[PDB]
């Protein structure tokens, strides 16, 4: 029966608790209500940002922008981990499987939620207190100007579906419970959970959006472009370190 | 039973029937050859270089290059078959002509491996309209670059064939792969999306009616496209290696057009 909604409300509740900056709060900053946010659009507005913005992650500018993204990546992984532990059935699985689920999942979820803080002209940074210009992100050089641009192109198409947090909570739960991650020992319970999650997502979309026919299908189709983005991201992550203090190097992966 | 559904089910019958008249070797006949139904003859199995020279006498230099350029002519013939099917998808021939070729350009490869799964089990693949069967371990035993082409399709086919789709489901699923709006360089995307919505609505109904005991087969089938597009990327990466390894070997012009990223 419609017990699916008890699941939908449960995960949305944990979504609000795990993630401080929600999508509704991010579009309001983006759109405009408020109390604004610092805008970084060139080289000098960057150095002023490190004085007024909340940059807690610090001698060349294109590298420091990449290090800051890597710093918040490991921040998001902790928030994603806490939310996964609230997905019913997750903590009861094999412990090795929980690791590999998160190991191969956090990237797809990072960029899914990055689209929430991204308009067509830039991205919100530092819990919405700053806004880095998209044109300034391609401004970079060598390999850096392209690391963020393919995600803008993804965010534009993903945001056109106009999903809210109640939809995204179930969606990312479906991503974590992917039974096709390499090295899984017990796939059956993972697929059993994800199927229960897909049922929840299909009912959520048809209820929340009688607008969009087959929006469930289109959202599933985005998981294709969501693994192509993660593929070419690590394709860039090895071109950077093929070029360019082991204790910060150990903090990151 | 309702006019909403009657529309989509008539659309399913239409696609299923163009499917039959576009593709000579259905999955139903393939499964008959591969398991051993009396409705079909039995293939000649090729597992080493010895049984290869015997296929010439039964079924219609450099052996590693040979199997590949027979793969090429097979892909060419299927692109023709895929095109004939695409012309039957309601609305497709009414979309912009350069968008028509854009859908086919990025579409044929994803269709090929879907239909290639119908000719496969875990042990090998049917070849030459079902008269032959080339074992999977013989294909790996091939030369240093050529031994790597086929096994990714084998890994996908076994996971994909586990969905247990029959030709009725594939006809609609193949139709939704051709008509997708995210392919690059598309001029007008909205008419393409309006047709795909119809096709996916037809697939959703067809899967729930044909496979009513399989929970959420619609969702699991759609995510198999992430597997298809990675196979295409691995394939392209092997084509740029062979193009510089064997600079004496030719590639078909038709596939040389799908051959641009
Ligand atoms: O006339 C000759 O001498 C000839 C030689 C070898 C083959 C074997 O070939 C196939 C034949 C039928 C069905 C499938 C294949 C094999 C393949 C692939 O290996 C492949 C790889 C990528 C896309 C499509 C295909 C495909 O259809 C065919 C003809």
Residue numbers in the entry:
A (entry chain B): 208 to 240, 243 to 267, 275 to 460, 466 to 474
B (entry chain A): 204 to 263, 275 to 475
What does the paper say about this structure?
Peroxisome proliferator-activated receptor gamma is a member of a nuclear receptor superfamily and acts as a ligand-dependent transcription factor. Endogenously, PPARγ is modulated by various fatty acid (FAs) and their metabolites, playing roles in glucose and lipid homeostasis. To exert its biological effects, PPARγ depends on ligand binding, which induces conformational changes in the receptor’s structure that lead to a dynamic process of corepressor dissociation and coactivator recruitment. Through this process, PPARγ activates the transcriptional machinery and regulates the expression of genes involved in several metabolic processes, such as adipocyte differentiation and insulin sensitivity.
